[PDB]
């Protein structure tokens, strides 16, 4: 029921936010299928016309996310087609932006403003759409994103402030990989029976491994430390999510897909590089310490842990530290159970299991 | 996709609330269509075992609300039947509750604890279910609720604390009335072309007018004033929502539906009693003055207006006053456009329209 499930919730979201989307709210405040087409068109136009920040900072992100989600569930052919049109447009514009504005030959130095535009105009919008709609990107575009942006974060990073770092995340890469696995699942389930099937996913995992490793080699300062740990965590989390996905995809392959299973070990010599694994543990340790400070618990530590960790600075980047610490632990448990992590890593995770509450204890 | 739309969101919601719902999260912390009916059974069990408070105070309310919503949208016949059984069961136990514990013949005096049980065990859960599932109640149950609880709030009111007041709402009544209109609308629509079809809707509107009037006659104290205005606001908003729903049903009748148009004029003498309309205006006035304090403007008033409005205590009942004020006004504009409110009321609503920021001005 479009009025109960789409139009009214939008109207209430807008009303609550106002106390770009003014002409939308303005429109509702007059009047008294052809109708729905016109509200949806106006809303889609605001979405495409706006800059959308990180949800922690911009109420527009969740307003559009909920609306697009409800539209999707309404399952009306003409509306699905409109959103697929928008995803196509966003990718055309993103490709141009990366080629021109983030060209490594460019002398322009303004990494903080470029990174902001990248996310506010393109990456946040496609990340919202890709929750419900399939998103796919050609090799050219994926390569531009990985080379012109992702690989360059650690040199751009000296220019960032905290709110720019906060915008950066890699959920779009996770989404791209999970939709790609999903396309293959169908082909493999109902093909049954190859050189570069894995190329885009292997490119993404390859790049996240290297980014994690380079961020760890960046010098920590009082000024950059919170944002640097946020970026590490962000890249570690997305990398974990992609590994788990691929691994699970693999477990859901039929016994007679033996060519498929071979091509994966052929094309993924590792999922997690050992040096990236070191940074995973460091981030587990960071969140452990933040969580412990929060609950006034004194942690045990193996001899050689960063003494940074004993009085970390306070951080605006993690608002629910418990959820995040727990969420990160649960993902590390995934990897343990798939044998991606070394037993030494398993031991350290469990070291403080008596001290951090009964939920953490159960997880381990 | 059940795991993507139902199971994972439930797991994350639990996880995030954990930082009687332990045994659910615990199941998730262990393992890796038959499984879905099973999770639905375990979650229904927890839902039925729990006491569910007001959403601002109890995280279980939104947790179960979202799970139930996702289950309904999945539209599997066997899952729908589980929730219809739960609705039938709640109704039976609510009828028993009202007969036994809230019988006016009863010597028990503990109305605050009884009203809490009423909402925590029965009313909150049927309200959650009624968002997606048709809730309908027979005459006996409706009369028990209206006689044994609703019409008695003004005398129970002296025993209440703030957290008990905050728990009372009349949403289930609005939902009862709107499901009833949906049912007529469908029949009118599919069949085409009445002596007591309006009886339950009329009973509800009947009772909400009397309650609003009775609450207005209740003596205010420094102690009870926040909770009193809250109950009055709560009854007024439920009443306005029902009136608007009925009016919209009327307006949507086919012009050859003469027997239908006649039955509404004839079984609805009035929608809003004059004495109840006085209370609507007092509540607009209350919300207007809370908003004005918030923004530090001095309001213009009518010559005889209650100066008390100038010196209102702060309230925890409305922690987004601006939105609440704007929402109440939107509903008033609706009743104005249906010709339920008179020019005096309309003039007063507009009095301070130059002073309360651009959105109120635009609405007015």
Author numbering:
A (entry chain A), B (entry chain B): 674 to 692, 698 to 710, 720 to 880, 889 to 1059
Recite the paper's sentences.
Sister chromatid cohesion involves entrapment of sister DNAs by a cohesin ring created through association of a kleisin subunit (Scc1) with ATPase heads of Smc1/Smc3 heterodimers. Cohesin’s association with chromatin involves subunits recruited by Scc1: Wapl, Pds5, and Scc3/SA, in addition to Scc2/4 loading complex. Because all eukaryotic genomes encode orthologs, Scc3 is the most important of cohesin’s regulatory subunits. It has roles in loading of cohesin onto chromosomes as well as its subsequent release.
To this end, we purified following expression in Escherichia coli a version of Saccharomyces cerevisiae (Sc) Scc3 lacking its unstructured N- and C-terminal extensions. However, this only yielded poorly diffracting crystals with a large unit cell. Despite many attempts, we were unable to obtain co-crystals suitable for structure determination, with S. cerevisiae or Z. rouxii proteins. Though S. cerevisiae Scc3 packed tightly as dimers in the crystals, those from Z. rouxii crystallized as monomers. Because abrogation of release is the sole essential function of Eco1, the acetyl transferase can be bypassed by mutations that reduce releasing activity. These include (spontaneous) point mutations in Wapl, Smc3, Pds5, and Scc3. Thus, Scc3D189E and E202K are in juxtaposed α-helices at the N-terminus while R996S is situated in a loop closely juxtaposed to the penultimate α-helix containing R1043L.
